[PDB]
RNA sequence: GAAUUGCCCCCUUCCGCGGGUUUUACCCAAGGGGGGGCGGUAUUCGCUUGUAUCCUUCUCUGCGGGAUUCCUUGUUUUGCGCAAGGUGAGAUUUUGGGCAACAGCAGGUCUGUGAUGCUCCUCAAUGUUCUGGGCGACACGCGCACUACAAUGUCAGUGAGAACAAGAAAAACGACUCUUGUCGGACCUACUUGAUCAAAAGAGUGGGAAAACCCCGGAAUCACGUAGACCCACUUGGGACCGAGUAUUGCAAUUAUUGGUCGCGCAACGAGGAAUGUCUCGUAGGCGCAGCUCAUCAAACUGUGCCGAUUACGUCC
């Protein structure tokens, strides 16, 4: 079906706000490993977790961005 | 005068003048949305909108090194002519926009052709980069 | 303008005789001298293939000329300049451009 | 809720790529056309293909491709300007890319002008060199 | 993992068939004077060598020419 | 009280100036040293001040003029020019003792203070695509 | 001061730092400079290329190939992010990791040629310290390049993955395989 | 004279007491006192923003300075030298070039020359032909040599903003207006206009004979705390082919000459078999500029600069 997706969906935003902020290393890349969404919309997605402080930042960067648990 | 080379002078010092140039509109933002001064593309004309960061530079620079006008300015334009016909690559630059920009900056910016700069609008918007932005949130 | 004597030549040890000695006349001898002096030496460089035909391993030669340039100043002499100039005429391929 | 998957814009299937201009390339159609999105009455970028016929409706786009002399009038931007069998045309197709083309071909073939001779044999018709490349 | 070292007390020769390798002379340090008694041995080594460098041996009782 | 000095690296010559204001701080060109956009280059230019204390030996005011090579080379030129200045100012306005101290800390570190650098670049030659490449042709 | 004695990578500390192996103690340098960008002229004499700080033997060793490569400055910027990953992953100072991952990254024994007769015959031949260093650097960097080509999408990450999986002894890395096979060849050519 | 008009204090020492103290010595938290720095003869900023005065560090150039010396008493024969270290701008043919013996080849060139022997051709010429048209290294299944561009996510790709390089190139052609024996223009480039509406083009004015003008030579690689787009797909990676419109160069651009924007990309190609090329430090590789040829067109050649490594410093297979 969809190896990577564009979608705004239930299970997207569900799995985001539970599984993701637990992880020790968080990149936009590794969410694309879950065969769910791109590494595109991942990035932007993470930025509105980081706004609401479910996750924290480690480096200001361009293309290279990462995050950790809060 | 102090325009460009004051306090910072990266993106930060250009964003604030663009913001200014909007609001109270005092400057032409002429028709022609279609125009490519830095070339090479097979995609949409400008992603971030060309007119938006273009304006500041053509008073800033012009009052830094003083009487840099029309064809001087294309030198800090860019390009490779990246896709060519299994040829090598060049520089290039298309000059026209600088003239119609410097006319649309002649309300506020350039004092005259002969000498340049008023009391320096960006000596002011420059000085609040130590202090304030237009907002502060998570990743600024 | 002012009085500007330039000297140009194809070699050194030609210029030096004219300038560095025999503008003696204007030097400490009778009148003021403001002496500036000498300028970028230019190179005129002609690269040329070495084979008169098409054969070989694609050898070349590079040939060169040197220009030499000089320049000196005088603060309005009123036809002492006649004297000062005329005494050195010396050395083939030195030319003298007075302004 | 519902995502795209195999939309149409000509009765011809079009991928649901997540930036809008890049989907339309399929329709021929290329990037430095599309950026008229301003005048196309969906000003969107950074927006999925899937949002069509909602309030960023489809036939908006479609109409502006059909007749671009009322949504703004420049040439130097049109496939065929100053036709040599009608006075002028705009022309943005398929379907007529494989018709209009073919007709130019046929015209030259007839009266046997040089460009038309060289193209019947399948040889290069521009400047061009042969005997080292292209080799099939 | 067992990794025995030893010191390069001197060099002997640079002896290979393209200069590929070199000979050298080793002082074992797992010598206890009693059930290890070796004094000085020789080994083949590979890459650039200089006295006072140390090397790593997982094998011993092999000389650098043998009878082979 | 002043002195001047120069650092150098490749073609690029960078001149410099040292003058006393002892509550004021160092800039290069017109841009102040904290703001010099490539992070890594910024680091390097600081190492003429971090080595040899802090503002402890140098709350003096310094400005440089770099001419004549690309970004990297400009950096290294700058370092040399700063450090040369510090030294030289000590020699003239202070004793030989404390001067010599500063030297020991520089030369210790991997700067090697008088790193004038004789390397330039050797010429293109007629039988080559520049200095040890030659040409390729078949059946050697 | 807080400058004169302090030397830090960007905050990472050289102060208490060790090499676990005595063999490669003096052929793995101790960094004491801020940043891994420096001059040259360590290839001007036979041994001088292991008196150079180890972070530069990482940076320079990661730049290979033309593609449009930005060379030095580029490389530095990636190394930065790599180290950061490592630090939060294994919860340990980055520098210490690297200086161990080196040591286990390369075989201690090797296989080369004394053979003749139009065929080869190979013996087992030991490896000088200088080799082992350089070999390790190489193979780790190689593992990254390959792994990042169209797999992951991540720009530093797989760097870090090699280094960590090296130091611990894991066979998930590139280098540790290489080592194993080379010794399973050498030792059984005897 | 003009402009911004603001920093999102420090060090040293003594004493007291509550904890930690094994009585004690010792140590940490908090507080108070003393001593020393200090706004110094300085807020900061203008290559057009001007007055005065002085200087030669940075520039230019002719002629000159500038090391197998010194030490390790190592190694070597006391010898010729060799290795490591030191000194220094530079450490061993200092670095890169040019020049280059004796003996030769039946190598190439009669398409370099008022360099040529003998022959051929000569008024319906194999001469001259700057004459009109075609052909030329160009014509097309196919083999080979050298070059350039790619298969992308190590700048990687279309967008934006910041900084930033040096060798080098240009001037005279009987016409013109000047007086009595000579001015200007044919070559570059700046600014301004065109532009109350694309590029490319057009036009007017000004400077420079070159260290004065172009020029503070704003190169590209590159950098970004730009919350930029893109997401692993032959996709927005690459373009090859292909149609239409337009302007310039030239006496003549048709077999598209060169630019410049739309469509064609669904044409190849996803790291490449046997084999093979030349390289040891400012080098390899990546990147750009100029000169050359010359109405017009360089993926070539010659030269200069930027970014800048890995390995070896050995052997005779």
Coordinates of C-alpha atoms in Angstrom, one line a residue, chain B:
Chain B
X1 CA 25.7 55.9 7.3
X2 CA 26.2 52.4 8.5
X3 CA 23.9 50.4 6.2
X4 CA 24.8 46.7 6.2
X5 CA 27.8 46.0 8.4
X6 CA 26.3 47.4 11.6
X7 CA 25.0 44.8 14.1
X8 CA 24.7 41.3 12.6
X9 CA 23.9 41.5 8.9
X10 CA 22.8 38.0 8.2
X11 CA 19.2 37.0 7.4
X12 CA 18.1 38.7 10.7
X13 CA 18.9 42.2 9.5
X14 CA 17.1 41.7 6.2
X15 CA 13.9 40.1 7.6
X16 CA 13.2 43.3 9.8
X17 CA 13.4 45.7 6.8
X18 CA 11.1 43.4 4.7
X19 CA 8.6 43.5 7.6
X20 CA 9.0 47.3 7.7
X21 CA 8.5 47.7 3.8
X22 CA 5.1 45.9 4.3
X23 CA 2.7 47.3 6.9
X24 CA 2.6 51.0 5.8
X25 CA 3.1 50.4 2.1
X26 CA 5.2 53.2 0.6
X27 CA 6.9 51.2 -2.2
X28 CA 5.9 49.7 -5.5
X29 CA 5.7 45.9 -5.8
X30 CA 5.1 46.1 -9.5
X31 CA 3.4 43.5 -11.7
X32 CA 5.6 40.8 -13.1
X33 CA 5.6 37.9 -10.7
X34 CA 7.0 35.8 -13.5
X35 CA 10.5 37.0 -13.6
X36 CA 13.6 34.9 -13.0
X37 CA 16.8 36.8 -12.4
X38 CA 18.7 33.7 -11.2
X39 CA 18.1 31.1 -13.7
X40 CA 18.4 27.4 -14.1
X41 CA 15.0 26.2 -13.0
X42 CA 12.5 23.7 -14.3
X43 CA 10.3 24.5 -11.3
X44 CA 8.1 27.3 -10.0
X45 CA 9.5 30.8 -10.3
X46 CA 10.5 31.5 -6.8
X47 CA 9.6 29.4 -3.8
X48 CA 10.0 32.1 -1.1
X49 CA 8.8 34.9 -3.4
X50 CA 11.5 36.9 -5.0
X51 CA 10.2 40.4 -4.3
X52 CA 10.1 39.8 -0.6
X53 CA 13.9 39.7 0.3
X54 CA 15.0 41.5 -2.9
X55 CA 14.0 45.1 -1.8
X56 CA 16.3 45.7 1.3
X57 CA 19.5 44.8 -0.5
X58 CA 19.2 47.5 -3.1
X59 CA 19.4 50.3 -0.7
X60 CA 21.6 48.6 2.0
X61 CA 24.5 47.6 -0.3
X62 CA 24.1 50.8 -2.3
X63 CA 24.8 52.9 0.9
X64 CA 27.5 50.6 2.2
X65 CA 30.0 50.9 -0.6
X66 CA 28.3 54.1 -1.8
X67 CA 27.3 54.8 -5.5
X68 CA 26.9 51.1 -6.4
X69 CA 24.1 51.5 -8.8
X70 CA 22.5 49.4 -11.7
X71 CA 25.1 47.1 -13.3
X72 CA 27.4 47.2 -10.2
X73 CA 24.7 45.3 -8.2
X74 CA 24.4 42.2 -10.5
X75 CA 27.9 41.2 -9.3
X76 CA 26.3 40.0 -6.0
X77 CA 23.7 38.1 -8.0
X78 CA 24.5 34.4 -8.4
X79 CA 24.1 31.5 -10.7
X80 CA 25.9 28.7 -12.4
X81 CA 23.8 28.3 -15.5
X82 CA 23.6 24.8 -14.0
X83 CA 21.8 22.9 -16.7
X84 CA 23.5 23.4 -20.0
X85 CA 23.7 21.2 -23.0
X86 CA 26.5 19.0 -21.8
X87 CA 28.5 22.2 -21.7
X88 CA 30.4 23.4 -18.7
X89 CA 29.1 26.3 -16.6
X90 CA 29.3 30.1 -16.3
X91 CA 28.2 32.9 -14.0
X92 CA 25.4 35.0 -15.5
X93 CA 22.9 37.5 -13.9
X94 CA 19.9 39.4 -15.3
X95 CA 20.1 43.1 -14.4
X96 CA 16.7 44.7 -15.0
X97 CA 15.0 44.3 -11.6
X98 CA 17.6 46.5 -9.8
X99 CA 16.5 49.6 -11.8
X100 CA 12.8 49.1 -11.0
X101 CA 13.6 48.3 -7.4
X102 CA 15.8 51.4 -7.0
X103 CA 12.8 53.4 -8.3
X104 CA 10.5 51.6 -5.8
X105 CA 13.0 52.5 -3.1
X106 CA 13.3 56.2 -3.9
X107 CA 10.3 57.1 -1.7
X108 CA 12.3 55.9 1.3
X109 CA 15.9 54.7 1.1
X110 CA 18.0 56.5 -1.5
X111 CA 18.2 60.3 -0.9
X112 CA 19.2 61.1 -4.4
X113 CA 21.2 59.5 -7.2
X114 CA 24.2 61.8 -6.4
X115 CA 24.4 61.0 -2.6
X116 CA 22.5 58.4 -0.7
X117 CA 20.8 57.6 2.6
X118 CA 18.5 59.7 4.8
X119 CA 18.9 59.2 8.5
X120 CA 19.2 55.5 7.9
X121 CA 16.0 53.5 8.6
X122 CA 18.2 50.4 9.1
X123 CA 20.5 52.1 11.6
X124 CA 17.2 51.9 13.6
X125 CA 15.6 48.5 12.7
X126 CA 19.3 47.3 13.0
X127 CA 19.6 48.5 16.6
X128 CA 16.6 46.4 17.6
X129 CA 18.1 43.0 16.8
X130 CA 20.0 43.2 20.1
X131 CA 16.5 43.7 21.6
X132 CA 13.3 42.6 19.9
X133 CA 12.1 40.5 17.0
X134 CA 8.5 40.5 15.9
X135 CA 7.8 37.4 18.0
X136 CA 9.8 34.9 20.1
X137 CA 8.7 31.3 20.3
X138 CA 10.3 27.9 20.5
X139 CA 13.2 27.7 18.0
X140 CA 14.2 31.3 17.8

